Amino acid sequence: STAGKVIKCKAAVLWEEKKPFSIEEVEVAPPKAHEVRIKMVATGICRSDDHVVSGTLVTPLPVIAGHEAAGIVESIGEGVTTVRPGDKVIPLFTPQCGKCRVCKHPEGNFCLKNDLSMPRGTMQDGTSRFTCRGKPIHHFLGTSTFSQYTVVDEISVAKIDAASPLEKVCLIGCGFSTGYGSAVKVAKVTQGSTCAVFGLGGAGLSVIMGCKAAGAARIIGVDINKDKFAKAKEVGATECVNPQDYKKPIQEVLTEMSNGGVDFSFEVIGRLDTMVTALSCCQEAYGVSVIVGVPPDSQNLSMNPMLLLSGRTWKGAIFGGFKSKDSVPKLVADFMAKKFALDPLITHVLPFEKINEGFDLLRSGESIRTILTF
Amino acid sequence: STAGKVIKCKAAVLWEEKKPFSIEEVEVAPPKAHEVRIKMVATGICRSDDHVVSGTLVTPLPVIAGHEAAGIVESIGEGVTTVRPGDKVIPLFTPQCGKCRVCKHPEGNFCLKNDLSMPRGTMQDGTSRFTCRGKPIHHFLGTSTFSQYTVVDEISVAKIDAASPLEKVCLIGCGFSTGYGSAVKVAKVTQGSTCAVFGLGGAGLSVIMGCKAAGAARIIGVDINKDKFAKAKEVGATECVNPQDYKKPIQEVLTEMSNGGVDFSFEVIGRLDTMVTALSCCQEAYGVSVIVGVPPDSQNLSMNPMLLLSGRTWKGAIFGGFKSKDSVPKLVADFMAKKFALDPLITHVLPFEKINEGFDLLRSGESIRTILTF
Ligand SMILES: NC(=O)c1ccc[n+]([C@@H]2O[C@H](COP(=O)([O-])OP(=O)([O-])OC[C@H]3O[C@@H](n4cnc5c(N)[nH+]cnc54)[C@H](O)[C@@H]3O)[C@@H](O)[C@H]2O)c1
Ligand SMILES: NC(=O)c1ccc[n+]([C@@H]2O[C@H](COP(=O)([O-])OP(=O)([O-])OC[C@H]3O[C@@H](n4cnc5c(N)[nH+]cnc54)[C@H](O)[C@@H]3O)[C@@H](O)[C@H]2O)c1
Ligand SMILES: [Zn+2]
Ligand SMILES: [Zn+2]
Ligand SMILES: [Zn+2]
Ligand SMILES: [Zn+2]
């Protein structure tokens, strides 16, 4: 039995920025009250994890990163009522405490208990459950999924269907839900509309999926890497454009293509310039632009507010606007009912031990999602 | 006896930036096809008119400014079907052509025939109906209401109730409708919400009116001129704050006052900094901020897109989001039925000949709206 005991297990530790993960033994403390210890089954390599490595996203180091995953509960702390040992679960990088003003709001999802705004890299109690070589190791977004075992707060975990294929549904923990919700919930894409999606990685493909599910008539994918175009078309893009192919700025090209601007645009990259371009390519009087990409730490963009005065709406969201704990189980049920597909996102499957090779695939442009299996 | 003939009348001509208007004779051509010549009865002095003087809002000079007004049709050009001689009318600084993609869209109001995005200072046919000292004079926003007579395109005029009091209802042509619609239509303020309104001039008071009409529980007025606070409270502000009274930045103050950010904020000034402050003070996950103020020409703001990524919505609008020709007559009818008040906005009355005094009143801080009578 492991319950109540420290577990020694394998994890991928990031000791400092811009270095490979170190795959080595860590100690995972047992869960305290209202905490849940999970044996990981599969975890995705999301660009946001790479942002931790690159310094784009600041969070305390050393750290166990990873936030898109699925696993099986090993044990529960005192007071846990929402999961039990043996349950399949998805950790929630945006928590749902159910008590804060955001949780209580019909349209809010960015729960005040999140560890994204002002990252501390701990459990909710301000402490860590991880040690490595005698040193405390930070958590990441209350999840820390690049480990054979993690400990999360109850507010940061959802129970899912016992029959779920964990090596696919982990993607509901981040990339699928983010992109899909950004289209269907945050933008509220309408039937017959024209959409433009900047960035055709895992999140941008999931935006396309949502735009298509919402009935868009035209979905224009934009990427500088033309190798991304075939899969974008497969999941619903009606046309793809590479900014590098054009003498004019791509906002001008997209405005022309759409006979005066798109209905809905999405920035799914994380660059300041593309955020402004994406805003500008939506129709000036009634267009809506949604920022999904994570910007480089502490940098501001510059823009002319006449873009908004004319009538545009600009918004952003975390996790597709989904209230995480309510939504994740429903999304998994929807997947099991064949309401959407996840296979188009998965290009590589590797053992956990090959995490660095998985990150190399992302960085080279060669993958959409690598799933790591424990 | 004037139909088909040039009218000589007095107008207020702006020959140069940063100078008084010149009250002098102009020649007003008869209306061509689908144009309407109007005998002006009352016009308001809007800060946007002052923007023309100051070079905040760039439009070609020399110019006849004025865009908030009401009058009586003197004559109609060939093919005009929507007004007749003797009708009371409000010129529409935002046209409603009824045919463009914006006019056809359920939400859109910034008709593509507008002269605001790229001002040319002409009629729709690219010519002027005004001569002064033998020289052609530009139009402003297709209205040019600082004249005893003006000529507008049919898409830029609405027929209003024959029993309307023109010295009141002119304010439906800009300041009232802009602010009220910004709250009720663009922001969609909800019952029980907390709103913050930056700038307590005519447009900002009209925003407060709309927030109260929508049932907001708290309406926090923000102005650096504390003389503005008494009227703001009369029309519905629950509290007023002067940024100059505080050591901390006002976005921090407002976040604290609202126990974590306001539901709806409005920038009703025209400053880059207050546009970003107003965004920042709305709740980071579900807040909405609406830009109403007109920015200084060609200047860009700087902001951190993490303000949006957390979930905020940022939008702007012209004319409160109202489709102008549909909406103006309805607003007049509602006013006649006492559904809203205009007198709180009217602080001074002058004859047209005292236009420069009226601008002096606005610039000193003393007035909300001066109404000029012809
Ligand atoms: N808001 C959230 O909750 C959330 C969740 C998931 C991902 N993200 C962010 O979303 C972004 C995309 O993530 P992903 O899809 O996993 O990453 P990804 O697989 O790296 O995809 C990004 C795509 O952008 C393309 N690209 C790079 N530069 C440009 C350019 N200048 N113009 C056009 N295309 C360009 C690039 O070729 C690639 O296909 C990242 O910044 C993530 O951090 C945010
Ligand atoms: N979007 C539209 O369709 C539209 C229509 C009407 C008015 N406008 C604009 O809206 C703005 C307000 O117009 P208005 O109400 O007629 O003008 P106004 O009477 O000049 O009111 C502006 C108010 O802002 C106050 N103010 C100035 N600087 C600051 C500051 N730093 N912080 C807080 N308060 C400050 C000032 O004291 C004044 O009471 C102007 O820029 C107009 O051009 C836009
Ligand atoms: Zn919460
Ligand atoms: Zn992610
Ligand atoms: Zn139109
Ligand atoms: Zn105005």
Swiss-Prot record, chains A, B:
<dbReference type="InterPro" id="IPR013149">
    <property type="entry name" value="ADH-like_C"/>
</dbReference>
<feature type="binding site">
    <location>
        <position position="46"/>
    </location>
    <ligand>
        <name>Zn(2+) 1</name>
    </ligand>
</feature>
<dbReference type="GO" id="GO:0042573">
    <property type="term" value="P:retinoic acid metabolic process"/>
</dbReference>
<feature type="binding site">
    <location>
        <position position="292"/>
    </location>
    <ligand>
        <name>NAD(+)</name>
    </ligand>
</feature>
<feature type="binding site">
    <location>
        <position position="174"/>
    </location>
    <ligand>
        <name>Zn(2+) 1</name>
    </ligand>
</feature>
<dbReference type="InterPro" id="IPR002328">
    <property type="entry name" value="ADH_Zn_CS"/>
</dbReference>
<comment type="subunit">
    <text>Dimer of identical or non-identical chains of two types (E and S) coded by 2 separate genes at different loci.</text>
</comment>
<dbReference type="InterPro" id="IPR013154">
    <property type="entry name" value="ADH-like_N"/>
</dbReference>
<feature type="binding site">
    <location>
        <position position="100"/>
    </location>
    <ligand>
        <name>Zn(2+) 2</name>
    </ligand>
</feature>
<keyword id="KW-0862">Zinc</keyword>
<dbReference type="GO" id="GO:0042572">
    <property type="term" value="P:retinol metabolic process"/>
</dbReference>
<feature type="binding site">
    <location>
        <begin position="199"/>
        <end position="204"/>
    </location>
    <ligand>
        <name>NAD(+)</name>
    </ligand>
</feature>
<dbReference type="GO" id="GO:0004745">
    <property type="term" value="F:all-trans-retinol dehydrogenase (NAD+) activity"/>
</dbReference>
<keyword id="KW-0963">Cytoplasm</keyword>
<dbReference type="GO" id="GO:0005829">
    <property type="term" value="C:cytosol"/>
</dbReference>
<feature type="binding site">
    <location>
        <position position="228"/>
    </location>
    <ligand>
        <name>NAD(+)</name>
    </ligand>
</feature>
<feature type="binding site">
    <location>
        <position position="48"/>
    </location>
    <ligand>
        <name>an alcohol</name>
    </ligand>
</feature>
<feature type="binding site">
    <location>
        <position position="48"/>
    </location>
    <ligand>
        <name>NAD(+)</name>
    </ligand>
</feature>
<dbReference type="InterPro" id="IPR011032">
    <property type="entry name" value="GroES-like_sf"/>
</dbReference>
<dbReference type="Pfam" id="PF08240">
    <property type="entry name" value="ADH_N"/>
</dbReference>
<keyword id="KW-0479">Metal-binding</keyword>
<dbReference type="InterPro" id="IPR020843">
    <property type="entry name" value="PKS_ER"/>
</dbReference>
<feature type="binding site">
    <location>
        <position position="103"/>
    </location>
    <ligand>
        <name>Zn(2+) 2</name>
    </ligand>
</feature>
<feature type="binding site">
    <location>
        <position position="48"/>
    </location>
    <ligand>
        <name>Zn(2+) 1</name>
    </ligand>
</feature>
<feature type="modified residue" description="N-acetylserine">
    <location>
        <position position="1"/>
    </location>
</feature>
<feature type="binding site">
    <location>
        <position position="97"/>
    </location>
    <ligand>
        <name>Zn(2+) 2</name>
    </ligand>
</feature>
<comment type="similarity">
    <text>Belongs to the zinc-containing alcohol dehydrogenase family. Class-I subfamily.</text>
</comment>
<keyword id="KW-0560">Oxidoreductase</keyword>
<protein>
    <recommendedName>
        <fullName>Alcohol dehydrogenase E chain</fullName>
        <ecNumber>1.1.1.1</ecNumber>
    </recommendedName>
</protein>
<feature type="binding site">
    <location>
        <position position="67"/>
    </location>
    <ligand>
        <name>an alcohol</name>
    </ligand>
</feature>
<feature type="binding site">
    <location>
        <position position="111"/>
    </location>
    <ligand>
        <name>Zn(2+) 2</name>
    </ligand>
</feature>
<feature type="binding site">
    <location>
        <position position="319"/>
    </location>
    <ligand>
        <name>NAD(+)</name>
    </ligand>
</feature>
<feature type="binding site">
    <location>
        <position position="67"/>
    </location>
    <ligand>
        <name>Zn(2+) 1</name>
    </ligand>
</feature>
<feature type="binding site">
    <location>
        <position position="223"/>
    </location>
    <ligand>
        <name>NAD(+)</name>
    </ligand>
</feature>
<dbReference type="GO" id="GO:0008270">
    <property type="term" value="F:zinc ion binding"/>
</dbReference>
<feature type="binding site">
    <location>
        <position position="369"/>
    </location>
    <ligand>
        <name>NAD(+)</name>
    </ligand>
</feature>
<feature type="binding site">
    <location>
        <begin position="292"/>
        <end position="294"/>
    </location>
    <ligand>
        <name>NAD(+)</name>
    </ligand>
</feature>
<dbReference type="InterPro" id="IPR036291">
    <property type="entry name" value="NAD(P)-bd_dom_sf"/>
</dbReference>
<dbReference type="Pfam" id="PF00107">
    <property type="entry name" value="ADH_zinc_N"/>
</dbReference>
<keyword id="KW-0007">Acetylation</keyword>
<keyword id="KW-0520">NAD</keyword>
